[PDB]
Amino acid sequence: LVPRGSAVPLCKQALEDLEKTSGHDHPDVATMLNILALVYRDQNKYKEAAHLLNDALAIREKTLGKDHPAVAATLNNLAVLYGKRGKYKEAEPLCKRALEIREKVLGKFHPDVAKQLSNLALLCQNQGKAEEVEYYYRRALEIYATRLGPDDPNVAKTKNNLASCYLKQGKYQDAETLYKEILTRAHEKEFGSVNGDNKPIWMHAEEREESKACKSPTVNTTLRSLGALYRRQGKLEAAHTLEDCASRNR
Template sequence: MSQEDVLHSTKIVIQGLEALRNEHGKMLDNIIGSKQSSSMDANKIEEKAGLLRKSMDMIELGIGEAQVMMQLGNHLQNLEAEKHKLRSQVKRLCQENAWLRDELAASQKKLHDCEQINAGYSVELEHLKFLKDIKQYDLNENNSALTKNSSPTNISSAQTTDVVDDLFPNDDDMYSDQQGANGGNQSKRFDSYADLMASTSQSASGSFISSTGYEIPARLKTLHNLVIQYASQGRYEVAVPLCRQALEDLEKTSGHQHPDVATMLNILALVYRDQSKFKEAAALLNDALAIREKTLGPDHPAVAATLNNLAVLYGKRNKYKEAEILCKRALDIREKCLGALHPDVAKQLNNLALLCQNQGKYDDVESYYKRAIDIYTKTLGIDDPNVAKTKNNLASAYLKQQKYKDAEVIYKDVLTRAQEKELANKPSSLNQQQETQSGTNNENYDAQGAWYKTILSDQPTVTTTLKNLSLLYRRQGKYEAADALENCAAKARKDPQAILQALNIVKQTNLNTQQNASSASSVS
């Protein structure tokens, strides 16, 4: 039975019970009336009246229960109606929610489209700035070419160098990076971007011609400088689209198998490498290597540059054996093309030594470093910063092998040369600046600025040397001397006189060591 049938039956039962109650009431009235008028047995009459009253009580109870059932039925109906109402509200809310979701999706799509349009405008704006810089660059180059045509002897004077990137930065490189972060030479850590600008001279047409005759378009050099600027600022979201746009333009105009495309692949790979996107960088470098080997030949300097960049990448991923193979091949190419005494050969030897050092091949490390020092000394001079840096690296290799005496000799030699260079470059008129006239005073300030510029340019290597020498003394238990050298290292960046203080500390430490050794031998 349904709920409605139950309620209908209950109503009928209530009506029947009420009729029965009325009937019993009349019967009870009749019995009471007959009791007064008749002479029937009073006990029987009372018994009948009691039965009627009891029956009426039962009828009243039934009517009450039926009414309760009716109330319950009405309550259930109200609940069902409320339930139906709530279901309707839920359905309406679901419809509204679905509509809001559709509206949100449409708004998100519009936002995404706007962001893409905005990003496209940003890239286009950067591209327009790039084209503006190229036009300005071409204008400057044309003016420069006119000047050079009037003075033929200066045509071959514009020289650039291919800076080989160190595989594993030491304290020296870290200091240079810190300088860049503080507003100094921020392009220091991106030197390897100048990957194909090796030994080039500018032609009258505005291109850069390498020593092997390969023409490098001037706009690639301009793009290279812009990428350095953006990457050094950490603005990879600008540098990467800039490279990709230039790469796309080159592929459309020259085809994928073109040396300029390989150069752009190298630049983009180095940006990815600085972002630690090693997988993407390796793919680009391998592509660039294949293009250069096919178009320029397997023994071209540009191939050596790409091999070196790929070796750098493998070194950062701790694949030292694979990196060593690539580095040796790059070394062979540079020796064949540039000669055994070229500075770039020495830079490649530095990289190879660092790789071998990470593999524990210290005999090869010593051989490579000594050969690099010899090349730098013969080609660039004993006071070239590369000589001091390579000596410092060799001493660090000795330090790792616990060859403290050999390391100390080299560290002391580096500091001595730095002190001698300081004294040689220091202008004699610095102490008389306050006593001279205005014009001469300006000249003295210029001389002082040039002197400080020369001295402070060597400070990263000097600071590293002082720190490494401090570490050496600390390992030998000479803690007082180690602390003193650390103080000198902290002051060396601003005060070149700290080098002299360090040398005095080294001299005094050696003197104390000799005295202690003499005392120990006399006691024995």
């Protein structure tokens, strides 16, 4: 988006000018390093981009101090850049610290914390640290499900995410229950209090195995995923029920 030619050296002038005018100490030096970091990211120079954010990080820690919101953003951005190079180990602590700042500022249960927890879950997943992924998605789900309505997309999205983590660990039961929660709640979004005369799709699926309700891209995924668990259990007719529901709502 910015042709690789004169941009970097032009910024390096702007920096030397800022250092001479605003003082060597000035907080704005951090912002200039930030613009430099941005230019490097645009040229896909990720290693170079990360190096400069670090320098801006140190300046913001001195000026704006620890626990300052702008330090939290920096730590996230640097964690992202580290992730793009596959350096997940060194990204985790940066991300874990940002979470601690965010908890101090907003409180343990603000929606923006649940964002960090999901970001933090995703990094661990890239390191194969399943037990921690489990932990972080559970923390996030706790916030989403409590703070927001049952119909909120973050709930189902986190539940799917956690389900996959459960699958990785061989916790098939826990995943299956999660999937059923999503479908049951979606069934109850127009078909009332799910009485005997009114069962959710997965019940019909399983009762069909011992021998209409297809009225969202997230639900679709849930349907196909629970379908895969039935396939693992050898309940192929139950699997088709959910699968045919998905492929008809596309």
